[PDB]
Amino acid sequence: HLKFMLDTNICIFTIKNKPASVRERFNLNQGKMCISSVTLMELIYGAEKSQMPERNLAVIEGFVSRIDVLDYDAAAATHTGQIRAELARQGRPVGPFNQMIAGHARSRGLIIVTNNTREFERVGGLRTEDWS
Amino acid sequence: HLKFMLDTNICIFTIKNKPASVRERFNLNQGKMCISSVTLMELIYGAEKSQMPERNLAVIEGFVSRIDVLDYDAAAATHTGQIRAELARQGRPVGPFNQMIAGHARSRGLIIVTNNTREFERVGGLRTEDWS
User: Fold this and answer.
1) Which of A13, A25, B79, B119 is spaced 20 to 30 A from B87 at the CA atom?
2) Which residues form a coiled coil (chains A, B)?
3) Nearest residue, CB atoms, B37 vs list A73, A84, A86
4) Residue A4 pairs with which residues in a beta bridge?
């Protein structure tokens, strides 16, 4: 059963084995991890904008096949909308894709795994961990 | 079968029945229209931050019951990443949520209905209409 939603940086760190501690923790939690399709979007952007698009796309494809990719659905969208309004009320900045990842995680009761701890902690009702 | 994906502005115009031309075309295309869950997120944000949230959330409720809401899936994410890379290459600005709506539409072979033709025409391989 899913416990963790990995943020984009955490996926990249796992793929790069750097910081090595992230891949180590990844292997301790197999079967319990997923990403938002929003993170898949960020990963594909990284690959297609790179100097080696085909190679890096295959890397992403291989990586995501080992975990679940969750569709960003009405529940995720609604939590995200609520979160954005609350952040606006408090005058707190969170980047657009991170807002969506946060709402997606919260909509599924998942822990967000991220190295951007302070930013995600601006969001209410959301648990985070860092594996770095 | 679906033909159009409405962007957030077009939904609001439909809801407000102003400009009335949008609602008119909307009713001519019943059963053929949808929104990305990304647009649902924007609508929920708008209602939650408003001065009458409960009332405006009910409006969204009602509106959303009359159309299809499509989950933003891996295919949508993949088109979006490609699009962002291409826009960046060309130095063309498109807002983050609009990038995602464009990718979702392109992944499904849908026409984007928008009053922001300037932004969406920057995306390659994308058909658009303006109903305003």
Assistant:
1) A13
2) none
3) A73
4) A33, A111
| Per-residue three-class SS string for B12-44 | HHHHHCCCHHHHHHHHHCCCCEEEEHHHHHHHH
The experimental method, as deposited, was X-ray
Phi, psi of B85 (to 5 degrees): -65, -40
- What is the stated resolution of the deposited model, in angstroms? 1.8
In chain B, positions 12-41, which contact chain A (CB-CB < 8 Å)?
A: 37-38, 40-41
Judged by a CB distance cut-off of 8 A, whether residue A100 touches chain B is yes
Q: Which residues lie below 8 Å from residue B77, measured CB to CB, with a gap of 6+?
A: A37, A38, A40, A41, A44, B103
Contact A44, A63 (CB under 8 A): no
**Residues of A whose CB is below 8 A from B71:** 71-74
Residues in chain A closer than 8 A to B47 (CB atoms): 81
**CA B77, B34, B127 angle in degrees (round to 5)?**
70
| Dist CA A52 CA B65 (whole Å) | 44
Residues contacting residue A33 through CB under 8 Å, at least 6 positions apart:
A2, A3, A4, A5, A6, A26, A67, A68, A113
Q: Confirm if B41 and B98 have CB atoms less than 8 A apart.
A: no
8 Å CB contact of B44 and A78: yes
Q: Tokens at residue B79, please? A: 């088109």
